[PDB]
Design a protein around this ligand. Structure first.
Ligand code: CNC
Ligand SMILES: [Ca+2]
Length: 256
């Protein structure tokens, strides 16, 4: 058995100066981290790269960032919904850990963890692609730990607005659900199996699921996985698809 803990990855890969992760984008003046991995590009255990969508390579195109952030509250100077905004996208929501900011030992392992962003639905499927990672060779994927991001936790709990018209509704109110999917692929890129996990559920007397507030184990036991994709499904979905921020944090991936 091995565990990918993220804690030993190159610091140069850590998301942006602040918890907005300004270096996850081409255009904000920082060396942009498109690619994370454990050792070198030559010999790695794990590797994710940002997708390219309409010729543009960005965290929004779907991918996985390395983070050591755990802010879940308006820091000095921030107001309104800031702590569950995209300007704190990189933060894990972890209530088991009193101090908040950068390397505050808030992973299921140390300070570090992956932040998954992206999803595909009927509205964006023509252009968008799912976040993905790879093993260097096919592996038994035993399981992994997960936790919500402050952004996702917040918007589930309170909703928000975004852009001119965008509305996200609290899931308690509209009897909503939100789910993450872990899709395992084989050595030839064949789908082995898709794994589902409810992050929240308040549907009709369905077992109610409240969002986790600390790291929670996800048993998989998939054989011969070369690569993994993530998607999100949820019922908070209008004219332009899913409104709930399509993010999850990941730590301590166990393999053999
Ligand atoms: C297309 C799209 C969409 N996006 Co963008 C995505 N992917 N997005 C984009 C693109 C914008 C379009 C463009 N430049 O041409 C694109 C790829 C740049 C983008 C970017 C972002 N987006 C992001 C997110 C998280 C989201 N996006 C959605 C709005 C998400 C949408 C899904 C949805 N249900 O809305 C979405 C699929 C459709 C928007 C649309 O046309 N609707 C029309 C409407 C919302 O108002 P509008 O004035 O016509 O639309 C504008 C804004 O919505 C704005 N916009 C788009 N995304 C966001 C996100 C935020 C936080 C804000 C404040 C504005 C935007 O772009 C639109 C065109 O100007 C989102 C609901 C998807 C999701 N379920 O995760 C979600 C917001 C969650 C929430 N409740 O707040 C990013 C933070 C992703 C990231 N990891 O970086 C990022 C923020 C900007 C950046 N730093 O690059
Ligand atoms: Ca870790």
């Amino acid at each position: 058995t091995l565990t990918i803990t993220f804690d030993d990855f190159d610091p140069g890969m850590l998301a942006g100066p602040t918890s907005a992760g300004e270096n996850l984008y081409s255009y904000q003046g920082y060396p942009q981290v498109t690619t994370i991995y454990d050792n070198t590009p030559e010999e790695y255990l794990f590797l994710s790269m940002f997708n390219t969508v309409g010729g543009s390579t960005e965290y929004s195109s779907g991918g996985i960032a390395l983070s050591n952030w755990n802010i879940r509250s308006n820091q000095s100077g921030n107001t309104g919904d800031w702590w569950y905004s995209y300007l704190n996208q990189c933060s894990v929501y972890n209530t088991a850990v009193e101090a908040e900011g950068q390397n505050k030992e808030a992973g299921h392992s140390g300070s570090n963890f992956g932040v998954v962003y992206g999803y595909v639905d009927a509205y964006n499927q023509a252009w968008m692609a799912k976040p993905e990672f790879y093993f260097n060779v096919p592996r038994k994927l035993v399981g992994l730990w997960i936790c919500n991001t402050s952004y996702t936790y917040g918007v589930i709990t309170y909703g928000n607005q975004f852009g001119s018209t965008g509305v996200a509704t609290p899931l308690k109110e509209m009897k909503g659900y939100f789910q993450v999917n872990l899709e395992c692929y084989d050595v030839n890129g064949g789908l082995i199996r898709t794994y589902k996990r409810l992050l929240a559920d308040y549907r009709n007397g369905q077992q109610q699921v409240d969002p986790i507030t600390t790291w929670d184990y996800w048993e998989i036991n998939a054989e011969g996985v070369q690569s993994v994709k993530f998607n999100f499904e949820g019922s908070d979905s209008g004219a332009y698809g899913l409104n709930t921020p399509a993010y999850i944090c990941i730590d301590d991936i166990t393999i053999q």
